[PDB]
Design a protein around this ligand. Structure first.
Ligand SMILES: [Zn+2]
Ligand SMILES: [Zn+2]
Ligand SMILES: [Zn+2]
Ligand SMILES: [Zn+2]
Ligand SMILES: [Zn+2]
Ligand SMILES: [Zn+2]
Ligand SMILES: [Zn+2]
Ligand SMILES: [Zn+2]
Ligand SMILES: [Zn+2]
Ligand SMILES: [Zn+2]
Ligand SMILES: [Zn+2]
Ligand SMILES: [Zn+2]
Lengths: 274, 274, 274, 274
């Protein structure tokens, strides 16, 4: 029999967290990742769940996530270490029948608990499930370096920020045609920042936390990591261009419109209008 | 018997795509690579081709590529993943007797198809075969970070851009004496951008897509990767120099002329004249 | 029986030094690391200590460290090489009953000796033991690139430097609420620089050596590495922002105060007052 | 019996070239490395030399290197590939009794030849042998990115350039107290550039080729790589500082003098006088 550590989802969590560590996006415990699973994903491994159950209440009831299993990163845990000890740094949790709390079925050994950003994660999963008819399955947060730097210089406005990111790499509009939501700075690890993030997730797959980092949503680990990597790559280009004194030329509005038409996407109107 | 995955060409595709991933040039699916093979390369592996054939028509007939096999990266596929599952992310294709389409002989599993930039690739192979009497065998596209940044600041002009790249690392003129072609921004994944790229490939081994990336051509995977790496290294130096306020000194015209003479190359006259 | 090289502490020293090498923080011999152990940590491995003893006097008596074992990096040794030959590059030392010197129990083969920055390390351990009621166990020095660059541009003042680092990544105030001490430039490898560093370690977990690097203290290798990585990440963001012409917006004083309250930390008053 | 590929010197060449590749210093074939061996180093492996000899004349007789064996990188070879096929990319050569040429005893398979920069290497070895009473054994050339960028902005003057590098990391004066020689731009791969480099090697362990790269000399692979890594790290810091608008404070002349005194080195007078 297959060890749960060799499962597609444990291996995928290891790959995404390790890749993000190597990118320089996740110093110390700066990042968190949650992946929504099906019962059918974890059923073959149920002898691993065979447990003195651990139950933890949610800060807010989440009835839409009733009975739903997730694999999640732990509070205070380092992305760098996930590859070294998956069961210490990751846990499989299942939200209970009423959405009032969850059991820790596997992992998060030695009294570890899920990420302190669980509200932002679970509330965003809720909104993304509604927004995508259940197709989005991943919420990823990291401290993407160039995106963070840009939050000190670009206006903290969805249209302006989205438009610069679209201009800074051709495929950006195709990968995130709904653009990038941006919050004011907020104290992290709170219900409030969770709820503010989730409200932006209704209309965007990416949300920026100024002076902090980024949240992304997608259907798979690779597509979510790739979404963030695309925005961060554009941010990296922009930081270089702005450091050289700014753009002498760029992708025009008309060109962005043509791009959207070709790829069958409706670009965020506010960003396109600039 | 040798598995096809251990072949020189599958191993080479893995090395080039993995190296480019590690460079930060190929976020998400941002990049594509095609390598022209001989019948003699794939003949020893023909039991791997033993197939429910898949046939796909080309958007434009390419009679010059009749009967020609290639190994290619897939549409929507991540350079990061090639090492993890070569058969999922790569395919061996063979253009048919008339050049009207190709069979997928191996790989591109689960209904995967070749890169969306196949026109730019195949049309460029055609022009490079003519330009080099059949010596060029590789077309590589990636999202080379500093080259991209420079397209927002340097004039989008072959002579000017070539000349700065030559100045930004001594060996540039020796590695690409024909210089760098540069298109206007165009909607990607089209016949039009393919044909525009191929027309520049007649007179240059490197072609820039502003605000997007670079295409390179060469006789081997290493020489093509190395060509791009050289241009991108010069671009990296230039981005640093421009960020520091610009050049106080540089390689002179006379010095570039002397360099060309020593290495027995005829540098692009327009770039040399500046 | 377990080889000492497979011990948690030898493996941890290898991980931290290798990670720091990969970060670009430790060119040549530029860095040093010391970890305070318990007798119980090394007792299971005592057959490895079975030795023609080597004894080296300390430059200054350190009675508070009497009888205390440490694992340490060697003088003139490369962080890059620790993974290749742990016993050549690391040593287990034990401070004697009076604190007048130490024995080299294991490692530092071929007449190697502990780091030339041993005074800064051991004196800082002393002050951190007092400051944290024995909870801090690690002193790490490296040449963190962006922190070094910032010492040429930011005022060399604890309040100003701390405040910018807090602003450059949200979690900074939470990770180092006591802020960052900063010395004037001093000749390294001396008792004087050791004593100056230790005096700052009384009131901060991080101390900057202008035009040189950083010292950090924490309870574990990961928490100490993570502390430095956090400060250096903020420094990296700031270098990008300053290169783009400076901040247009940032985390406010009020926001920093709110952050401190939420995380139950008392931020350094001088930095908070700006 | 030990394969020659497992020898200390083949393994060391692999480590240095691979490390330099990972640094981004050696795109394409941009770099070369030569290590002077003793007869006693290669004697245990002589059954590997058992050969249809290959002999190649030197461009200039080098009687001081008579009978001397070296391990060297090949012309047109990629540092990236050394780890994949050491015998293809490296060769063991022995200069003949008169210094008129050398035999290729091992490696450089498929008619490969030593680096095109052999004059710069061998002539520099000659001068460094004289300068250090035979202690220096390595000449390394690479395309160190930040050092290259600085050659477009700093005055191309030994005193000025040395002084900035000393200021940009404290240990620089200790690692290269003799400073950094700097040539005018010259056509590479020539006897002339070789002889110009060697003349600077009489009085410095580092020599800059503007708009091209750096040459370094030292007693071991690690000390030579570390020398270059130190200068390049300082260059990296300086590029960041200059990009942020320049130094507000720095290491003073008096401080550099104090540093030299403490470490028992005589710093280059011209650089110290600024
Ligand atoms: Zn965060
Ligand atoms: Zn069960
Ligand atoms: Zn919005
Ligand atoms: Zn592309
Ligand atoms: Zn067949
Ligand atoms: Zn052209
Ligand atoms: Zn140091
Ligand atoms: Zn004992
Ligand atoms: Zn203080
Ligand atoms: Zn070179
Ligand atoms: Zn023999
Ligand atoms: Zn000189």
């Amino acid at each position: 029999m297959q060890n749960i550590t060799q499962s597609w989802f444990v291996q995928g969590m290891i790959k995404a967290t390790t890749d993000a560590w190597l990118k320089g996006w996740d110093e110390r415990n700066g990042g968190n990742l949650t992946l929504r699973l099906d019962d059918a994903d974890i059923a073959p491994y149920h002898d691993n769940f065979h447990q003195q159950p651990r139950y933890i209440p949610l800060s807010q009831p989440m009835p839409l996530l009733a009975n739903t299993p997730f694999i999640v990163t732990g509070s205070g845990k380092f992305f760098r270490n996930v590859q070294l000890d998956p069961a210490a740094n990751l846990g499989i949790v299942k939200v209970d029948s009423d959405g009032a709390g969850y059991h820790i079925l596997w992992g998060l050994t030695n009294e570890a608990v899920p990420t302190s950003e669980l509200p932002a994660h679970f509330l965003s999963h809720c909104e993304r499930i509604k927004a995508t008819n259940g197709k989005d399955r991943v919420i990823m947060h990291c401290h993407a370096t160039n995106l963070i730097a840009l939050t000190y210089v670009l206006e903290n406005d969805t249209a302006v920020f989205t438009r610069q990111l679209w201009e800074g790499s051709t495929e950006c509009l195709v990968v995130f045609p709904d653009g990038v939501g941006i919050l004011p700075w907020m104290v992290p690890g709170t219900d409030a920042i969770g709820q503010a993030t989730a409200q932006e997730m209704q209309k965007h797959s990416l949300v920026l936390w100024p002076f902090h980092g980024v949240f992304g949503s997608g259907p798979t680990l690779d597509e979510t990591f790739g979404l963030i990597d695309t925005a961060e790559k554009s941010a990296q280009v922009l930081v270089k261009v702005y450091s050289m004194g700014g753009m002498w030329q760029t992708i025009s509005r008309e060109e962005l419109i043509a791009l959207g038409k070709r790829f069958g996407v409706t670009p965020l109107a506010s960003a396109l209008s600039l």
